Design a protein around this ligand. Structure first.
Ligand SMILES: [Ca+2]
Ligand SMILES: [Ca+2]
Ligand SMILES: [Ca+2]
Ligand SMILES: [Ca+2]
Ligand SMILES: [Ca+2]
Ligand SMILES: [Ca+2]
Ligand SMILES: [Ca+2]
Ligand SMILES: [Ca+2]
Ligand SMILES: [Ca+2]
Ligand SMILES: [Ca+2]
Lengths: 146, 146, 146, 146
């Protein structure tokens, strides 16, 4: 019985055990106890903090060392954004600054995340400020040392 | 010099040659001659007609048999939808019915694509009708024989 | 003496006690007091509302926590159908809408079950309407919120 | 890469290789190259010649010794019948006598399969005679030595 960490839009971990060593996205969503399956987007959180979308029939090999990270969220569209030069797709419409800094792999307290707008003033997203990713265009976030 | 087929939101193929046998998404976007790189979403079109998103640093192994299929489109968000039970993410806001039926792997003329609304009348998308995927909720498309 | 809930085509529970902790389908049919054994189909009703057929020699482990659910019905053929994307086999030829919504795990009053016909009008099955599953093809039922 | 034998209503084997050690019925149907998934019934052919239905989300552990046997057939209903006292469900409406004797585990040439009708004359099914299982009632087949 392998184990994984199912997250949410707030990056709250939730250990879930699966008998299948190599389950599909549908199996992971079933294990998360979220229904219907078609309404939820699942992304594999790679060790380098990269969110790669996983499809309902795409298998994720859990038969490795360590507990894998999976982010399952109720979503109908994935919004693209850049955090510290890393491309990501967030399933949900709004993202908190603490989540952005966690994705950047930096200390939430020691760093401040800024939406970088070249030529204009950058917008500082607070730790618990739900910045809306629905804004037109790809969002470039950078974590400046506080 | 490997070769790939770069598509668009209209699924118009465009053969592009790359020296790198295993290039990244950034290299593919550069080869497509589309700038800036950050504004374009690239999806690998798998042989089973599955669009899997590819990231700017994720490598795509082109050193295989046959010409691989890549879809590069100017996009800031990926809209999720189901076509014949297959999960897909479309980079662009609008999709034509001919593209939907091509993704379904069926003859565009012999089939008609319907947005299935359980309990209500299904919406028939015409061959050159640009259905908007921005509609709230995941879209379920099914290709009924004409 | 373990206990189980023997159901019927109307999903009417009936507590039955068995001395054998791990009885076979034949033993369960005998405990249900239904003769001859060969004319009755038995399905284990899994906790996730999945009906999995059980054979006369296949053992069902009752030595677990909670009372298990068994559906025993006079049947010569199992008709396949999809309810909310879940595959099921109904032993009897006709199924009531209340049974469909119970299988879907939703409130019978708050939801309405529809036979989904892509491209055509969906057929609303009433709560006590005995829809015939003998219709050619696999039936796709979806419970829309009322 | 594990391997399985995908059969059909004529019990024609077809070796198929799967990367997933423990795939679901949906994965097996995908590997068989049969679409749509919802129209096909899959049954695990147990070593004792027992056909046990497998569901689209039910996992089949292939990580064992020997090549497992899977029967995938286009089916909307499973017809129940007894062959040599063994309960079976045939996905397709018609079954050939050679298939019946193969299920009985006996030599097709050395044995003759009879539909046993108590009190009346038993009906001998020929080797390549497509007996219809749609006949009302459970069919009891017995293989008498020729
Ligand atoms: Ca698996
Ligand atoms: Ca600035
Ligand atoms: Ca955005
Ligand atoms: Ca390279
Ligand atoms: Ca949508
Ligand atoms: Ca026992
Ligand atoms: Ca409809
Ligand atoms: Ca039917
Ligand atoms: Ca006789
Ligand atoms: Ca029959």
């Amino acid at each position: 019985r392998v184990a994984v960490q199912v997250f949410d839009e707030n990056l709250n971990a939730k250990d879930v055990h699966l008998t299948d060593p190599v389950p599909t996205g549908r199996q992971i969503i079933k294990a998360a106890g979220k229904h219907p399956v078609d309404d939820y987007a699942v992304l594999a959180w790679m060790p380098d903090n990269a969110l790669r979308p996983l499809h309902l029939d795409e298998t994720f090999d859990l038969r490795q060392h360590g507990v894998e990270r999976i982010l399952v969220a109720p979503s109908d569209t994935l919004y693209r954004f850049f955090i510290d030069g890393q491309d990501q797709e967030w399933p949900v419409r709004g993202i908190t600054g603490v989540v952005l800094k966690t994705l950047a792999g930096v200390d939430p307290a020691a760093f401040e995340v800024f939406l970088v707008i070249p030529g204009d003033d950058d917008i500082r997203v607070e730790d618990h400020e739900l910045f809306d990713l629905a804004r037109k265009g790809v969002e470039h976030f950078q974590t400046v040392k506080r």
